[PDB]
Amino acid sequence: SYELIQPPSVSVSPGQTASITCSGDKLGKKYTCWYQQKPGQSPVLVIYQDNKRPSGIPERFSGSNSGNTATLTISGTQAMDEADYYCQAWDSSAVVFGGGTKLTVLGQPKAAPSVTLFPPSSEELQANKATLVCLISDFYPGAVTVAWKADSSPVKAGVETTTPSKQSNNKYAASSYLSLTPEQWKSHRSYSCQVTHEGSTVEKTVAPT
Amino acid sequence: QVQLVQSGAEVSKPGASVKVSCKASGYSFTSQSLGWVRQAPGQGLEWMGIINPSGGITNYAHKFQGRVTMTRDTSTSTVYMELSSLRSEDTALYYCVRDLSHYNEVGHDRAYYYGMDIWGQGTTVTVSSASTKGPSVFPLAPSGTAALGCLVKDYFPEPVTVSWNSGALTSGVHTFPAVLQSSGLYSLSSVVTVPSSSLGTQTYICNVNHKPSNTKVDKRVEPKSCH
Numbered sequence: 069s070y071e072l073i074q075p076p077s078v079s080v081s082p083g084q085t086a087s088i089t090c091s092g093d094k095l096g097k098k099y100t101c102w103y104q105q106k107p108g109q110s111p112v113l114v115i116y117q118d119n120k121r122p123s124g125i126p127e128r129f130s131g132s133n134s135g136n137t138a139t140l141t142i143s144g145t146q147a148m149d150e151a152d153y154y155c156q157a158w159d160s161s162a163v164v165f166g167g168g169t170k171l172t173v174l175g176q177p178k179a180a181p182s183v184t185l186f187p188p189s190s191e192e193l194q195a196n197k198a199t200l201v202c203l204i205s206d207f208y209p210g211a212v213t214v215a216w217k218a219d220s221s222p223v224k225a226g227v228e229t230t231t232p233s234k235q236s237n238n239k240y241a242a243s244s245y246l247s248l249t250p251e252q253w254k255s256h257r258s259y260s261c262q263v264t265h266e267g268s269t270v271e272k273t274v275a276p277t
Numbered sequence: 278q279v280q281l282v283q284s285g286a287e288v289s290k291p292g293a294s295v296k297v298s299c300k301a302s303g304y305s306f307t308s309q310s311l312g313w314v315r316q317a318p319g320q321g322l323e324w325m326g327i328i329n330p331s332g333g334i335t336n337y338a339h340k341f342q343g344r345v346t347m348t349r350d351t352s353t354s355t356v357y358m359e360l361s362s363l364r365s366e367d368t369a370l371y372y373c374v375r376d377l378s379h380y381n382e383v384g385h386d387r388a389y390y391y392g393m394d395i396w397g398q399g400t401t402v403t404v405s406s407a408s409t410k411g412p413s414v415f416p417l418a419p420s421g422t423a424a425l426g427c428l429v430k431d432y433f434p435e436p437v438t439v440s441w442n443s444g445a446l447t448s449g450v451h452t453f454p455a456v457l458q459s460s461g462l463y464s465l466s467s468v469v470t471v472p473s474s475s476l477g478t479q480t481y482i483c484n485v486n487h488k489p490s491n492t493k494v495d496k497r498v499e500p501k502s503c504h
């Protein structure tokens with residue numbers, strides 16, 4: 069099944085030019101769309117047929133589709149342009165969406181995340197349950213990806229992560245939980261929480277000892 | 278004056294079915310195809326399918342074949358989406374969309390790709406069989422500044438309020454949004470960063486309050502044994 073690859077986050081400053089790419093096998097052969105979803109409202113069509121703007125869409129928004137990549141370009145970005153952007157194409161009449169790109173208009177310098185990894189409390193282990201809590205705080209822009217590791221092997225099941233929310237200091241925070249059996253907890257030497265933020269990874273590690 | 282208005286929010290049990298409607302207006306109902314796009318909380322957009330009101334032919338995404346039925350009533354300018362055998366991962370915001378494209382799969386001679394130009398406000402669908410349940414609270418003990426908190430686990434339905442030391446401690450406190458587990462119950466965490474020098478002298482108690490179940494629990498977060 070066809071797939072479109074978008075970067076999860078893209079940052080610019082007010083008045084700068086933002087460029088969001090979307091990659092797919094021979095994407096230049098197909099028609100592409102771009103949708104803008106602001107927090108709390110429905111998506112809005114900003115670009116259709118690779119480079120056409122619906123009436124009422126500002127001319128700052130432009131699109132291009134060539135080779136294997138489609139690109140949405142926003143010149144002179146304003147604060148109101150902060151939103152999630154989705155590319156969209158078709159694979160045998162079936163609509164396909166990209167993963168989405170969070171666009172951030174930087175209102176403060178970037179900040180690396182602070183990562184704290186909590187082992188299961190003895191009160192939870194005594195209740196025949198076990199939950200790992202990875203808390204991420206004080207980062208900006210508000211976009212992180214969390215990856216759990218059993219020793220050195222990735223864990224996929226039992227992982228639940230919240231969307232980054234704003235703190236009182238205008239910075240962002242997020243949480244991720246790894247639920248497993250108490251026996252899964254003792255059977256491994258260590259568990260790891262990897263938080264990648266703006267291309268660099270910060271990881272913490274806990275052990276049953 | 279083209280607009281799509283959708284039905285109200287729904288809560289459904291796993292295994293059952295849910296039917297959402299969408300009323301179109303501002304244009305001739307039979308002239309454009311209508312489809313459904315859903316979005317799990319915090320996730321991306323996921324297309325479900327479309328129906329051509331002129332003829333009633335449908336085209337569903339492969340993931341939903343056998344589970345979804347889309348119908349239309351031209352007299353009322355309304356389309357419907359029925360999803361059956363509901364599972365927890367069907368909890369999402371369901372968007373009604375107008376697709377100006379022409380698909381061969383719904384009777385058009387020449388396929389033509391345009392896009393979805395009008396979106397409804399969306400219909401929230403929650404899948405869980407849980408009833409009102411008070412939360413259990415577990416401590417996130419700490420070992421310069423130290424991080425401590427408490428885990429508010431398996432409650433229903435949102436929301437839960439969390440304060441620290443009966444509201445006396447507010448600086449550095451962050452209560453995270455809740456996450457819906459596959460069990461159908463909500464869970465969140467509340468953290469507070471404190472100075473390490475206080476851990477032997479200052480007691481830390483988080484106060485949870487679940488109004489739907491009249492549950493108030495106070496949990497003391499002691500430091501751990503080791504360093």
Ligand SMILES: *[C@@H]1O[C@H](CO)[C@@H](O[C@@H]2O[C@H](CO)[C@@H](O[C@@H]3O[C@H](CO)[C@@H](O)[C@H](O)[C@@H]3O)[C@H](O)[C@H]2NC(C)=O)[C@H](O)[C@H]1NC(C)=O
Nearest residue numbers: 307328329330331332333334335348349350351352383384
């Ligand atoms: C022109 O052709 C269309 C088919 O392309 C005919 O539409 C079909 O009409 C039948 C009879 O009305 C529909 O079945 C009935 O639906 C009603 C809905 O209330 C129900 O009460 C009946 O028990 C029966 O199921 C059928 O759904 C419909 N097909 C489509 C695709 O819409 C139409 O009748 C033809 N026109 C003339 C003048 O013959």
